[PDB]
Amino acid sequence: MPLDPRVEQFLAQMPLSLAEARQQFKQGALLLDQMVPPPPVDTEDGTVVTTHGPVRIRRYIPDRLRFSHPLVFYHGGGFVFGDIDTHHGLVARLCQTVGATVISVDYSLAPEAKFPVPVAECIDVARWAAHEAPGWGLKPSIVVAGDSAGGNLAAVVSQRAKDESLPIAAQLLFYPALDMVHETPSKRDFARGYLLEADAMQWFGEQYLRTPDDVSHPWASPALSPDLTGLPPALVITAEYDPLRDEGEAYAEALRAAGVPTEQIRFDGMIHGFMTMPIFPQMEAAIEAVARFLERID
């Protein structure tokens, strides 16, 4: 199916120290937010004590609370880039459109922290949120969410939840990375030219993982886990022209066949990252998909 027209234009107009590349990634996100300002939203900064140190968070409070579970959101950026500010545009809209409290998490970035530190941190924040939820007038079961690398973290947290005594009501995976071991057709075919590229993904893995053997670890590659029974209800959103598409859709099919309530939505003509790119109407359509999915959770 053809590239979305606006996506095609964006790709057509596209043209370093670690610090410079981080700043560049942040300038890119600010630019998009200037083009399509986020909705106003009440927020409160805070810090969660985790097993790997303090982790900054931002709690988003909807104008009108309509959803009975807190969302815990883990930003993407290949485990190296991104923060609460880069993902504000998405989180503010999730909060106001769903009508949910959202905890946005500033987990520790690679290469300064390596696998599996961010996983641990993200588990700890999820547990904190479950504990706090009654004091917010909410159910203790949380919804975890993330894009890309953040979708990886949401998926892994979801797999660890029962063993970690963590009540999780649902998982929202936005074009997640899930399998660092296997080539898929999409990973081969869309490896260059669609914003997320092969060589970038290799580099991210080099920064995040301790050794190449870590690719086979289920906390890096959750798609490898043989038993998906009993995992939380899943919304899995993919982009058609995304190297990560195929592993996302395959994981959704495996969840479904393991009896997990699963909604799988591919946005045709779209690319990786579209849910933090408000120049595309499909970002808000996907956020509407989230609200409609969460309506069904109870």
For residue 61, report the phi and psi dihedrals to the nearest 5 degrees. Answer: -115, 120
| Interface characters, 49-78, with ligand R5C (x: CB under 6 A) | ---------------------------xxx
Bridge partners for 58 per DSSP: 45, 104
Beta strands 71-74 and 102-106 are: parallel
Q: How far is the CB of 139 from ligand R5C (least distance, A)?
A: 30
The yes or no reply on residue 224 touching ligand R5C (CB under 6 A) is no
CA distance 272 to 290: 17
| Residue (191 or 254) nearer to ligand R5C, CB | 191
Written as six digits, the tokens of 48 are 């969660």
Structure tokens at 17: 């120290």
Q: Which is nearer to ligand R5C, 141 or 148 (CB)?
A: 148
Give the binding-site size for ligand R5C (rule: CB under 6 A): 17
- Of the candidate spans 6-14, 99-107, 207-215, 281-289, the one that interacts with ligand R5C by CB under 6 A turns out to be 207-215
Q: Which of residues 132-171 bind ligand R5C (CB under 6 A)?
A: 148-149
Radius of gyration of the chain from Cα atoms? 18
Instruction: Give residues with Cβ within 8 angstroms of 21, minimum separation 6.
Output: 81
Q: Is the dihedral of CA 21, 52, 69, 134 positive or negative?
A: negative
Residue 46 contacts residue 54 (beta carbons within 8 Å): no
The nearer residue to ligand R5C, 51 or 216, going by C-beta atoms, is: 216
Residue 148 appears among annotated catalytic residues: yes
Closest distance of CB 244 from ligand R5C, Å: 7
The catalytic site residues sit at: 148
User: Where along the sequence are the contacts to ligand R5C (CB under 6 A)?
Assistant: 76-78, 148-149, 177, 180, 196, 201-202, 204-206, 209, 211-212, 215
